[PDB]
Structure formats: structure tokens, C-alpha cells
């Protein structure tokens, strides 16, 4: 298919809530070499987030049920095996998009904004892997997540206003990485508060197109900081 036809298919699949189809379509667009438009970056991100997010949600449910299943080994064993099947799907999916980012998207990004977008995605999907990784494998995924977030963060601070949705959303996810993955609430809170404070300080840079996303992310920063100060 032409690129234009794949993008049309991705948009149809998104409307139809068929996210496997949407991801396959945007994977093809990516592998056909070129650089993505702004809308195509969002289609790609929406598709893989919904595909992986289904598994993350399913994993949390089965994990919960495993916990409540005290005193019944066959139930417990089934919950374990099914959790591991979900983890394996999640790993397939994350490694799929991580290969697209590392092989096609990041090395060919022309603009710093695109590059931050992909590097943030790389941090995100290594973070999702880390959520279910173990042993020495976790050490690798956690380290790769942190490095991708760090590189995105360096570029965003010099190239983007602090009200920029990508810069704000990167800080949000990096702070979640620090809090949930690295168990470092001071680093997490410092990053989240600093991102919030720098956005407010230059609130006059927030334009009409970014308003909805940037103000939502600012609220999520606050929501997280409120949560993280209960369980300090």
C-alpha cells in the first residue's frame, strides 16, 4: 500500500477501535523508511499505547487476583501462568515498537521535536518492560529507559518552551519512572515540581493549540505529587 493508504487505514482502525490493525498500519508506514508527520507520530503512539495498555491493565487485574488467592495452589498457579502469558505479549509488543524507534524513527528524525517525541516513547516502552521485568533483565530495561528519558530531557529543555506538551509530558513520564521504577521520590518530586513551576513561570508561552494538553499534564503532575506525598 501507499503511505497515504496506510494512514487512511490507521485512521479507520482508530475510529473502529481496532488497535491491532492501527498499529500494524503505522508499523508499515514506519518501516517504509520515511519520516512521520505530526499526525502520523500521534497515530503510531495512540495505536501502540492501546495495544500495550490492554496488557498492562490485564496484568494488573490478574496480579491482584493472584494476591487475593491465598490458600489454593491450583488457582494460584493458573493465575501465575496466565499473568506470564500476558507479560509475554506485552514484551512482544514493546520490543516491536522499540525496534521501530531504534532502527527507523530515532536515527532519521530531522527536527528536535520529533526526536524528543521518539526518545520519550523509547523511555516509555522500556519502562513498561521494566514494570514486568525481573533479575538482570530488569537492570537492562531500567537502564535503557533512564538513558532514553535523559536524552529526550536534555533536548527538550533547550529546544522547547516549558509549556510545550511534549516537554511537559516527558517530565511527567520521567518523574513516574523515577517514582515507580527507580524508587526515588525526591528525584521524582523534584522533577515533577520543577516542570510544573517552569510551566507556570512562563505560562504566557502556552498557545491555543497546546492549551488542552499542557493544562491536563500540569494537573496530572499535581495529581501524582498529591498521591506520592501520602506514601512518602
Amino acid at each position: 500500500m501507499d503511505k497515504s493508504e496506510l494512514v487512511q487505514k490507521a485512521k479507520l482502525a482508530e475510529q473502529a477501535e481496532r488497535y491491532d490493525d492501527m498499529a500494524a498500519a503505522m508499523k508499515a508506514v514506519t518501516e517504509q523508511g520515511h519520516e512521520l508527520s505530526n499526525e502520523e507520530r500521534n497515530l503510531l503512539s495512540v495505536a501502540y499505547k492501546n495495544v500495550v495498555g490492554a496488557r498492562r491493565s490485564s496484568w494488573r487485574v490478574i496480579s491482584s487476583i493472584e494476591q487475593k488467592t491465598e490458600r489454593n495452589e491450583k488457582k494460584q498457579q493458573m493465575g501465575k501462568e496466565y499473568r506470564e502469558k500476558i507479560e509475554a505479549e506485552l514484551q512482544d509488543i514493546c520490543n516491536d515498537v522499540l525496534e521501530l524507534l531504534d532502527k527507523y524513527l530515532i536515527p532519521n528524525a530531522t527536527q528536535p521535536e520529533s526526536k524528543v517525541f521518539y526518545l520519550k516513547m523509547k523511555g516509555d516502552y522500556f519502562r513498561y518492560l521494566s514494570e514486568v521485568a525481573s533479575g538482570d533483565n530488569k537492570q537492562t530495561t531500567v537502564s535503557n529507559s533512564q538513558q532514553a528519558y535523559q536524552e529526550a530531557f536534555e533536548i527538550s529543555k533547550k529546544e522547547m518552551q516549558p509549556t510545550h506538551p511534549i516537554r511537559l509530558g516527558l517530565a511527567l513520564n520521567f518523574s513516574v519512572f523515577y517514582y515507580e521504577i527507580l524508587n526515588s521520590p525526591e528525584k521524582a518530586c523534584s522533577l515533577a515540581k520543577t516542570a510544573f513551576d517552569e510551566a507556570i513561570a512562563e505560562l504566557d508561552t502556552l498557545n491555543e493549540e497546546s492549551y488542552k494538553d499542557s493544562t491536563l499534564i500540569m494537573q496530572l503532575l499535581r495529581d501524582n505529587l498529591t498521591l506520592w506525598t501520602s506514601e512518602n
Partner: peptide, 12 residues
């Protein structure tokens, strides 16, 4: 309850 993270599509 979990931490909230960034929406998957963003204005660029």
C-alpha cells in the same frame, strides 16, 4: 491506585 502518565497523542 497508580501514578498517572502522559496521554498518548500530543499537540506538536
Amino acid at each position: 491506585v497508580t501514578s498517572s502518565s502522559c496521554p498518548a497523542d500530543l499537540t506538536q
